[PDB]
């Protein structure tokens, strides 16, 4: 059984970053060469492992987290980074073991007239913990007066749309991101490289 990376990387649709998707990868042979050897990926950054050595290693499980952000935010998907995405949407731990893979998805995720279906969280009182997800849509209280669920002055809907049009600057173009995290618990190693 080959690991279902096809379903991860070649999926028709991707998650918004605030509602980022996680897929557990288990009980399979993981050929990482189809990935690291590819010209398809403009980010391929590995932490606590060497990408060239991936086909040699076994892990308890692999998790594939996936979502869309804009080009200029891809740098935030790395350990020790801060910003609206890292702080309020998707957070890697300082001691991350895994790989960050990204590619430009302008051709799929932009639309003439703008694609507004991808959202991120703009307002949040505190930073996310690593691998935390917040899909809440409570009106954000920016003053001393309670909002009572009503959008207005000092009372902000917490989510904002990206506006992806194909002729956007690359900083404003959509990028698909896949985060592979590797766990090596005191348990059987179910995900092994072919070699």
């Amino acid at each position, epitope marked *: 059984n080959l690991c279902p990376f096809g379903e991860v990387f070649n999926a028709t649709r991707f998650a918004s970053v605030y509602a980022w998707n996680r897929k557990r990868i288990s009980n399979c042979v993981a050929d990482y060469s189809v990935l690291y050897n590819s010209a398809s990926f403009s980010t391929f950054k590995c932490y606590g492992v060497s990408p060239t050595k991936l086909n040699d290693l076994c892990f308890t499980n692999v998790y594939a987290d996936s979502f869309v952000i804009r080009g200029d935010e891809v740098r935030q998907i790395a350990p020790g980074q801060t910003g609206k995405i890292a702080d*309020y949407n998707y957070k890697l731990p300082d001691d991350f073991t895994g790989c960050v893979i990204a590619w430009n998805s302008n051709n799929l995720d932009s639309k003439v007239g703008g694609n507004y279906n991808y959202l991120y969280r703009l*307002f949040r009182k505190s930073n996310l913990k690593p691998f935390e997800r917040d899909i809440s849509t409570e009106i954000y209280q920016a003053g*001393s007066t309670p909002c009572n669920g009503v959008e207005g002055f000092n009372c902000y809907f917490p989510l904002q749309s990206y506006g992806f049009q194909p002729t956007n600057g690359v900083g404003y173009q959509p990028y698909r991101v896949v985060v592979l995290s590797f766990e090596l618990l005191h348990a059987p190693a179910t995900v092994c490289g072919p070699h």
Partner: antibody
Framework: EVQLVESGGGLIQPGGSLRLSCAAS????????MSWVRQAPGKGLEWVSVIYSGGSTYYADSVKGRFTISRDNSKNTLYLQMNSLRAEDTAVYYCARSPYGGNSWGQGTLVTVSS | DIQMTQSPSSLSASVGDRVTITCQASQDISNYLNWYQQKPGKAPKLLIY???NLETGVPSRFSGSGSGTDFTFTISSLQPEDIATYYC?????????FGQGTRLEIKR
């Protein structure tokens, strides 16, 4: 409804330290994106620093390693700690809700760096 | 950094004239541009947010347009109280950057 009142401006020697205050009413400082922006006499506007609600902080390259932005929740006050001050830091310093949320600016406070 | 080039540096115009100021961003800033009016010794006041939106309380003689890199700010009919320096600002990218300003002078 929103009032931002800066204070702490005055003469300070080159290499000296000064802390600016911005007392807010009608918003919660710690709940907002809050910035300092400066304007040298007869020149344009220059963004200095930002603090996010979650606490992340960013700085203009010109003030990197010298200035610190901070807040006190109980006083509902934003601060800018300016160390190792140079003549080029002479400016009116404004606090603002920036870059997101309702657009509000204080009246400003003038800092002079001179021997 | 994103540079904001503002034109012209200064203009002189009569009461009643249509006035046009341009701002150009050095890379795409979508519609995340603000226009401010600064009267000497006072803080900048927001006139136009997100390229084209009139801040509440601002007279309807003020307008703005544009998206991407090219932006314009217009006073349809210049009033005496419109003597100020006008700044563009891109806000969605750090560092936040401003245009150099347009000093608006009146001929009489």
């Amino acid at each position: 409804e929103v009032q931002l009142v800066e204070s702490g401006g005055g003469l300070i020697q080159p290499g000296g330290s000064l802390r600016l205050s911005c007392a807010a009413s009608g918003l919660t400082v710690s709940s907002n994106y809050m910035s300092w922006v400066r304007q040298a006499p007869g020149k344009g506007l220059e963004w200095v620093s930002v603090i996010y609600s979650g606490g992340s902080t960013y700085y203009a390259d010109s003030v990197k390693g010298r200035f610190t932005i901070s807040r006190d929740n109980s006083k509902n006050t934003l601060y800018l700690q300016m160390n190792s001050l140079r003549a080029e830091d002479t400016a009116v310093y404004y606090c603002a809700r920036s870059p997101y949320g309702g657009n509000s600016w204080g009246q400003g406070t003038l800092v002079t760096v001179s021997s | 950094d994103i540079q904001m080039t503002q034109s012209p540096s200064s203009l002189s115009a009569s009461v009643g004239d249509r006035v046009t100021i341009t701002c150009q961003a050095s890379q795409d800033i979508s519609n995340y541009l603000n226009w401010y009016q600064q009267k000497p010794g006072k803080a900048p006041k927001l006139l136009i947010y997100d390229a084209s939106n009139l801040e509440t309380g601002v007279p309807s003689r003020f307008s703005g347009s544009g998206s991407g890199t090219d932006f314009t700010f217009t006073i349809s009919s210049l009033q005496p109280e419109d003597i100020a320096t006008y700044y563009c600002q891109q806000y969605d990218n750090l560092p936040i950057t401003f245009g150099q300003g347009t000093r608006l002078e009146i001929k009489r």
